[PDB]
Structure formats: C-alpha cells, structure tokens
Design a protein around this ligand. Structure first.
Ligand SMILES: *[C@@H]1O[C@H](CO)[C@@H](O)[C@H](O)[C@H]1NC(C)=O
Ligand SMILES: *[C@@H]1O[C@H](CO)[C@@H](O)[C@H](O)[C@H]1NC(C)=O
Ligand SMILES: *[C@@H]1O[C@H](CO)[C@@H](O)[C@H](O)[C@H]1NC(C)=O
Ligand SMILES: *[C@@H]1O[C@H](CO)[C@@H](O)[C@H](O)[C@H]1NC(C)=O
Ligand SMILES: *[C@@H]1O[C@H](CO)[C@@H](O)[C@H](O)[C@H]1NC(C)=O
Ligand SMILES: *[C@@H]1O[C@H](CO)[C@@H](O)[C@H](O)[C@H]1NC(C)=O
Ligand SMILES: [Cl-]
Ligand SMILES: [Cl-]
Ligand code: NA
Lengths: 342, 189
C-alpha cells in the first residue's frame, strides 16, 4: 500500500516475487530464505534478466553478530576456455561458446547453509506452482521480449515458451514455463548436487555443447561458491557501506562516493538551478575519475589488484582526484589518466 | 541482471544482484530442462574484438580457464554506527549499474530524497569511455544546460537508465521502493 512496513520488507522487480519473499519471512525464514525464494521467482517472471543458468553475488548483514559477508557465486570460464577464443562480439554473445559455468544454485546452497531457517524445498514451492500455472507477462519482460523479437521468433526452442502464434508474448499474455517447473522440482527434492553432480548435469553439458560450447561435466563438478568474510567497506559519516570487491564494482562505487563526500552535499546542493547544475557536473566528473581506474581491475585470484583497490578505497587518493575536478568544465579522456597496464 | 533487497524482522538484511548477462543470455534454452544459459563470457575483454571506437582491450580482464569476468554489479548494505541497517540498495540494467547505485545513495543520503523518490528520480551516466554523458528523458533541463555549458556532450537515453530496488530505515519503519522503469513493487509486513 504505502510501502513503509513496521517489521520487514522485500523489494524485488516483480510484485509477485516481492510477495513470495515476504511470505517466506512471515513463515519464519531468515532474510536469506526470503532472498532465495524471491530470486527463484524473478528467474521466472523476469527470465530475460537472471535465473539458474546464471550467477550472483549476495551481500549479507547479520544484525546479531553485526558482521557483513559477501557470497560470490558468479559464473567462471570453463577449463577449456582461453584468451583468444572469440574473434567477434557475435561469438562472445550468442550460442554455447558464450556460456560460462553457472554458479546460481551453489550460491543459493551456501547462503542457505549459513543462514537458512526454512527447508530448501519450501524455497522452490511457490515458484514451481507459478511456472506450471502460468502468469501474465509483466511490463519489464514484455519490453525485453519486444527488444529481442527478431532473435526470439527465429529460434524455435525460445519461441516454444516465449511466443503465442509464432510471435513474442506481450504484456498481460500468459507465460508458462513447464520444463523449468520440473527442473525446479528436481532441485527442491534432490538439492544443489542435482545441477552440479547429479541428475541434471549430463543434460546441461549436452545442451551447452549442442549450441557450440565447451562446458563439461568436470566444470560443473568443480564449481564452488565462495564466502568472503571481509567485504569492501567505506566509512561515510557515521555509517559503513558494505559492497563486494573485485571482480565486482565496489571499488568503483567506493571511489565515486569518497570523491563526492568531500563536497559535503546536502539538500542545499540541489535547492537552486545554480547549485543543482554544479552538483550534477561534479557527480559526472567523479564518475569519470572513478572509471579511469576501473580498467586495471579483474578477478583478484588471477590479477594482483590489492594496490589498485587500496587506492580506489582511500579518501586521500579520492581527495587528489576531487582537487582535479574543475567546476567550470569537463575534460578530455586523457585528463583522467585511464590506465590499461600496471 | 536483476537486483533484490531484503530486510528481515531481526534487522538482518540481504542485497542480491543476479544475472545471465544480456537479455535472454546466450539465447540457448534447454528444450529438456528449460534452463536459459548466461552469456557471461561476454563480460570478459578480448584482444581481437574492438569493444568501442577508441576503447582498447583491458589485459586484467582477459579470459583464462577458471577466471571470473569483471562485473558492474554492486549489491550494497549501509549500516549505522549503532549496528542497525540504514539502507539496502543495488541496481540492474547493464553498464549503468554502478553509477545508478551511486545516484540512489547520493539522492537519499545527501539530497534527503525519500526512498521512492530516490529510486524514481531521473538518472545520468558517464563512464569515461565512451566519452558522452547520457541523461534520462525527464531530467531537470537546468541540469542538461549546466552540463552543456560546461562542455559535456549530452544525449538522452532512448529507454531508461538502470533499475534500482532499495529499502531505507525511517521513523515509520522500513521504507521500500521498486523501480517503475521495470514495473516491480515491494511487499512487507
Ligand atoms: C578465432 O581465432 C582464434 C585464433 O586464430 C582461434 O583459436 C579461435 O578458435 C577462433 N574462434 C572463433 C569462435 O571463431
Ligand atoms: C547471525 O549469526 C548466527 C550465529 O552465528 C547465525 O546462526 C545466523 O545465521 C545469523 N543470523 C541470520 C539472520 O542469518
Ligand atoms: C559426480 O561426482 C563425482 C566426483 O565429484 C564424479 O566422479 C562423477 O562423475 C559426477 N557425476 C556426474 C553425473 O556429473
Ligand atoms: C573495513 O575494511 C577492513 C576489512 O578488511 C577493515 O579495516 C575493517 O574491519 C572494516 N570495517 C568494518 C566496519 O567492518
Ligand atoms: C596509488 O596512488 C598513488 C597516488 O596517491 C600513486 O602514486 C600510486 O601509483 C597508486 N598505485 C596504483 C597501483 O595505482
Ligand atoms: C570528450 O568529450 C569532451 C566533452 O564532452 C571533450 O572535451 C573532448 O574533447 C572529447 N574527446 C576526447 C577524446 O576526450
Ligand atoms: Cl520451461
Ligand atoms: Cl532489477
Ligand atoms: Na515504494
């Protein structure tokens, strides 16, 4: 109604999934239970965006211990991948070779082992129903289907679920996901191992290879979600902000905010057109300085990023960049000193 | 990419961003399992592929077996000195996730916008390369003028910039917002 709630809240990109997370909370689930239940649902209602074929990060705060952690369940390059595997955007964007090893389900499993309070099966139940029963296509999916209408209509296996009368579904029209329903059911009952080292595994490998990919059973067997006890943080006034470091973009966010905090923004910063305009100019320039550094980032297990990240989260270093923001002009690319090698 | 924010009754919280990368990922659906596979390989940099006009390959983000590609995602939790959660926030929607997340935080923490306004407020984006400031359709045009007179070349996003889900502690309890750009809505008790 108002969306101010006395006790608990779930904010997802589909109403039904916000509700499904809310119901898990109401039935005694932790924040993690609610997030998993909602995510299983978003994987259906916003299938273009995310799902069990993908990967995720969770930033988790425990109010008891007052500790934050991060769960890294992002996809990884298969063991057979190599630097020069692609020769055009087309090759890296479409078909099996574009597929990295999915981490989603191992990510749910780890977050659930550490923080769950409802049974695993209970998390999938509402989404199994939804996928079998069907749901009206929401605003977001409809626009994504419209955007990709050509590619979807010419591929029969996608059109099988995403079309009606050989044309992409529109908003309000019913979407059913009968195979995902079965798959979700298998996951609910057999657990995470069903995906990585169990009854779904050989079919996964065969689907990726049929489409030209190189993921093998061993890639699946070997996938691991990772617990990070010490996320990135930055201090802002009397508050701390927890966010994931590389390979995610916490260090960029940290740098944007640390640059901007030295201007002491407040309601006044946007009260008149003169102030507002200068304020937004400053924001954009902080974006530009923050991105200069970004191209030195990569997976910290393969790239040494400790120095880069240390700079990006340092208030002193941010103060040095803030002093180079001219209030009366933006600058050319080289002014921000983007770097491509250390 | 989709973003989800949760606060439970005990004050614990989750910020969760999940993705198959581009819309419908690889466009490979299993006819048997119905799984739709990611195209996360495309988040790697590649020496052959020309990314943008003038944009070089970044060797830190080349493909290696067992390597994870760089990502714009940034699921974030803000905790006050007293140990209570102040904000749970993150974004989805491509290259503009990190700047949209920054803007949501700036809007609420500094400009004093309530969470729904912070989510709905017009956004803008610049990432250095390419060398252009994108603004949303309904941005205050005094901002557009302030950028242009300071020599930014601005352009208007033809759709929208990112998708933000957020929760913020208030006097009234936990205030939640889902981004109308995608059509979501919060739920709680
Ligand atoms: C592209 O070229 C490289 C180097 O010649 C080769 O190893 C690779 O298999 C090719 N890949 C594709 C997808 O065309
Ligand atoms: C907080 O810590 C306890 C004990 O270490 C743990 O069981 C629980 O997962 C945490 N609380 C939540 C809501 O996850
Ligand atoms: C399951 O696990 C073991 C070792 O992890 C492996 O030998 C076996 O082949 C795996 N099974 C499947 C179906 O992937
Ligand atoms: C912030 O960053 C590091 C963690 O490695 C450390 O200085 C400190 O424990 C962190 N601060 C908080 C409040 O967790
Ligand atoms: C970190 O920043 C300092 C300037 O404060 C600079 O001299 C140094 O080279 C930087 N290190 C890296 C790895 O960028
Ligand atoms: C980039 O854009 C800015 C203004 O939008 C301008 O100063 C500059 O000359 C442009 N080109 C390069 C290569 O930086
Ligand atoms: Cl299906
Ligand atoms: Cl989203
Ligand atoms: Na709201």
């Amino acid at each position: 109604d108002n969306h101010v709630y006395t006790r608990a809240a779930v904010a997802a990109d589909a109403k039904q999934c916000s509700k499904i997370g809310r119901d898990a909370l109401r039935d005694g689930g932790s924040a993690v239970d609610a997030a998993i239940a909602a995510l299983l649902c978003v994987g259906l209602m916003n299938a273009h965006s995310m799902g069990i074929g993908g990967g995720l990060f969770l930033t988790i705060y425990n109010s008891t211990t007052r500790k934050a952690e991060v769960i890294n369940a992002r996809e990884v390059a298969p063991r057979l991948a190599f630097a020069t595997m692609f020769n055009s955007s087309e090759q890296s964007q479409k078909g099996g070779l574009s597929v990295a090893v999915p981490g989603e389900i191992r990510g749910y499993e780890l977050a659930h082992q550490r923080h769950g309070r409802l049974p695993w099966a209970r998390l999938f139940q509402p989404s199994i129903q939804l996928a079998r029963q069907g749901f009206p296509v929401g605003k977001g999916l409809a626009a994504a289907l419209e955007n990709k209408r050509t590619v979807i209509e010419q591929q029969p296996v996608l059109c099988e679920v995403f079309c009606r009368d050989r044309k992409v579904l529109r908003e309000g029209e019913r979407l059913t996901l009968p195979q995902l329903a079965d798959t979700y059911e298998t996951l609910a009952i057999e657990g995470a191992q069903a995906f990585y080292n169990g009854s779904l595994t050989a079919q996964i490998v065969k689907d990726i290879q049929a489409a030209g990919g190189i993921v093998t059973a061993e890639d699946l067997n070997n996938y691991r979600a990772e617990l990070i006890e010490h996320p990135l943080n930055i201090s802002l006034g009397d508050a701390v902000l927890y966010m994931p470091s590389a390979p995610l973009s916490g260090p960029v966010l940290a740098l944007i905010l640390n640059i901007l905090k030295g201007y002491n923004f407040s309601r006044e910063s946007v009260e008149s057109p003169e102030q507002k305009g200068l304020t937004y100019h400053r924001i954009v320039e902080a974006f530009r300085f923050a991105y200069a550094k970004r191209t030195l980032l990569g997976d910290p297990k393969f790239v040494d990023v400790t120095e880069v990240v240390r700079n990006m989260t340092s208030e002193f270093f941010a103060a040095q960049l803030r002093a180079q923001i001219s209030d009366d002009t933006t600058h050319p690319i080289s002014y921000y000193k983007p770097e491509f090698y250390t | 990419t989709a973003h989800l924010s949760v606060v439970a009754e005990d004050g614990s919280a989750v910020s969760a961003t999940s993705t198959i990368n581009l819309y419908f990922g690889s466009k490979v659906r299993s006819p048997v399992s119905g799984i739709l596979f990611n195209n996360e390989m495309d988040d790697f940099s590649s020496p052959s592929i020309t990314n943008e006009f003038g944009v070089p390959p970044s060797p830190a983000n080349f493909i290696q077996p067992g390597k994870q590609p760089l990502s714009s995602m940034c699921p974030t939790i803000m905790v006050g000195q007293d140990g209570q959660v102040r904000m749970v926030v993150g974004a989805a929607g491509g290259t503009q996730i990190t700047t949209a997340t920054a803007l949501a935080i700036i809007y609420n923490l500094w400009f004093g916008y309530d969470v729904k306004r912070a989510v709905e407020e017009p956004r803008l984006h610049n990432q250095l390369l390419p060398n252009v400031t994108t603004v949303e359709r309904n941005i205050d045009q005094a901002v557009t003028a302030a950028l242009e007179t300071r020599h930014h070349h601005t352009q208007i996003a033809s759709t929208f910039i990112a998708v933000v889900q957020a929760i913020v502690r208030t006097a009234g309890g936990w205030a939640a917002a889902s981004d109308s750009r995608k059509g979501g809505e919060p739920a709680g008790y």
